[PDB]
Design a protein around this ligand. Structure first.
Ligand SMILES: Cc1cc2nc3c(=O)[nH]c(=O)nc-3n(C[C@H](O)[C@H](O)[C@H](O)COP(=O)(O)OP(=O)(O)OC[C@H]3O[C@@H](n4cnc5c(N)ncnc54)[C@H](O)[C@@H]3O)c2cc1C
Ligand code: FES
Lengths: 96, 297
């Protein structure tokens, strides 16, 4: 399955199509979008962002506790979509 | 959606009205004085550990006998009074708090509640048909440093019994409380004042972690010379309360008699428009935050 993703970068919005078996940041990159990252194995803070709407399968991250997941925080480098989803990026400092 | 209320292990509708667990009556003690207007009993049942209930739930009772149509009576629900572990602390036991429904109508005719009267009437050894457990609405917070405000009137103290037992009487490895448990309980008489010596023993072993307040409508009035209703006693702290209402770890629970909340809402209205706030919209919001939780009948 492929679903719509809308990214609210600090330099405006941009949308794109992501297969539910591909990590989100992976896509953004081939689609020429510059999103912050570091580890690319889901136990850091660089790719941080916030879920506005829609759902994700970020099972296999390890950095966030449940209250941050509860708070709609997401690690882009290790998030697959399970629905059409809107997301703010460049949110590390906000988490920090 | 992940909730701020412990949802782990909680089971529902394990037995239904078609196939109720048949349990058995162990105790049954009147807990109101003799002068008391209404009469309210505290009862415990044998469960065989077969109903792993959790603090705040409620169960169903199929009263013995049939309606006019040869058909069973309808399930009545009663807020579970004992903690998970039961009153005996062995988890083979459930406890109910029941007021005997008896009124006179306008023809002089003494009317009695089917289930309420069936239950107070139970003797050690009688059988009870049991549905449940039921309700997710009144589960404890996950936060063991929570501010937990409990408003109760009459047999709406039941779940909060269940709450406190766990909090103050019991030792759990996974669960040690250390916030502030504030309780408001409103009643007619000092003879309708349920479980008081217990809450005493608590206030006695956790002075700063527990705060109680009672409201005897027919034996106290305020500085303004009006009957002490739950709201009236609360109004005596309209400060800390309103304050505590803006914290993230303050969770409110209201239980008891349909109508109490008009009383309370009215008090909150004047406190809200103080900050320029509309109450119901702040209400809603707390609710979305699972921070306001209501179970009245
Ligand atoms: C979530 C929940 C939790 C509850 N927790 C408790 C509890 O902890 N303790 C407790 O005692 N009860 C509790 N109740 C209420 C309980 O389920 C019963 O309805 C109640 O005990 C009386 O039942 P009964 O079968 O004896 O009366 P019923 O046989 O149900 O008779 C009640 C009928 O008479 C009428 N009636 C009822 N009350 C009056 C009145 N005061 N004046 C005039 N007419 C009336 C009503 O229209 C109703 O149809 C709870 C109810 C709910 C929904
Ligand atoms: S960059 Fe470290 S987890 Fe996404």
């Amino acid at each position: 399955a492929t679903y719509n993703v809308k990214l609210i970068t600090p330099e405006g919005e941009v949308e794109l199509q992501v297969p539910d078996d591909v990590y989100i940041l992976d896509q953004a990159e081939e689609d020429g979008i510059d999103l912050p990252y570091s580890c690319r194995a889901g136990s850091c803070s660089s790719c941080a962002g916030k879920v506005v709407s829609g759902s994700v399968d970020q099972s296999d991250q390890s950095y966030l506790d449940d209250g941050q997941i509860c708070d709609g925080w997401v690690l882009t480098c290790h998030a697959y979509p399970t629905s059409d989803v809107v997301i703010e990026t460049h949110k590390e400092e906000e988490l920090t | 959606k992940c909730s701020k209320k412990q949802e782990e292990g909680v089971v529902t509708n394990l037995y239904k009205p078609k196939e109720p667990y048949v349990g058995r009556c162990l105790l049954n003690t009147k807990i109101t004085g003799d002068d008391a207007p209404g009469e309210t009993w505290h009862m415990v049942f044998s469960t065989e550990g077969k109903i792993p209930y959790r603090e705040g739930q409620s169960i169903g009772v199929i009263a013995d006998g049939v309606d006019k149509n040869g058909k069973p009576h309808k399930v009545r629900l009663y807020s579970i009074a004992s903690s998970a572990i039961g009153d005996f602390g062995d988890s083979k036991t459930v406890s109910l708090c029941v007021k005997r429904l008896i009124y006179t109508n306008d023809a002089g005719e003494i009317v009695k509640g089917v289930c309420s009267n069936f239950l107070c009437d139970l003797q050690p050894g009688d059988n009870v048909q049991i549905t449940g457990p039921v309700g997710k609405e009144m589960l404890m917070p996950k936060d063991p440093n929570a501010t937990i405000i409990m408003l109760a009137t009459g047999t709406g103290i039941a779940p909060f019994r269940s709450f406190l037992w766990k909090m103050f009487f019991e030792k759990h490895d996974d669960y040690k409380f250390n916030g502030l448990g504030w309780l408001f309980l409103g009643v007619p008489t000092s003879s309708s004042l349920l479980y008081k010596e217990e809450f005493g023993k608590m206030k006695e072993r956790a002075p700063e972690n527990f705060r109680v307040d009672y409201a005897v409508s027919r034996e106290q009035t305020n500085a303004a010379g009006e009957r002490m209703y739950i709201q009236t006693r609360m109004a005596e702290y309209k400060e800390e309360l309103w304050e505590l209402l803006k914290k993230d770890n303050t969770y409110v629970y209201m239980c008891g008699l349909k109508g109490m909340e008009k009383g309370i809402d009215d008090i909150m209205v004047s406190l809200a428009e103080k900050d320029g706030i509309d109450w119901f919209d702040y209400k809603k919001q707390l609710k979305r935050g699972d921070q306001w939780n209501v179970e009245v009948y």
